[PDB]
Design a protein around this ligand. Structure first.
Ligand SMILES: [Cl-]
Length: 74
């Protein structure tokens, strides 16, 4: 399942995931291509901060779905 992860400055990245994949894995995919540690990532879908322990299916994510990535300093 190909989804988009968009940032405020406009750049997008395609991430391949599955309905059973946990949000933590999505962050790990972003880390693979961007080098941003999962702990510094905040993924938002439909105005909701995505929980690391939950799965893509819990947010009803489909092909083409756009997630929003923002930095969260720790
Ligand atoms: Cl940001």
């Amino acid at each position: 399942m190909l989804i988009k992860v968009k940032t405020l400055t406009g750049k997008e990245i395609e991430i391949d995931i599955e309905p059973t994949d946990k949000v933590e894995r999505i962050k790990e995919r972003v880390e693979e291509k961007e080098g941003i540690p999962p702990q510094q990532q905040r993924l938002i879908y439909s105005g909701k901060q995505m929980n690391d322990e939950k799965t893509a299916a819990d947010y009803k994510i489909l092909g083409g779905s756009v997630l929003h990535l923002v930095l969260a300093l720790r």
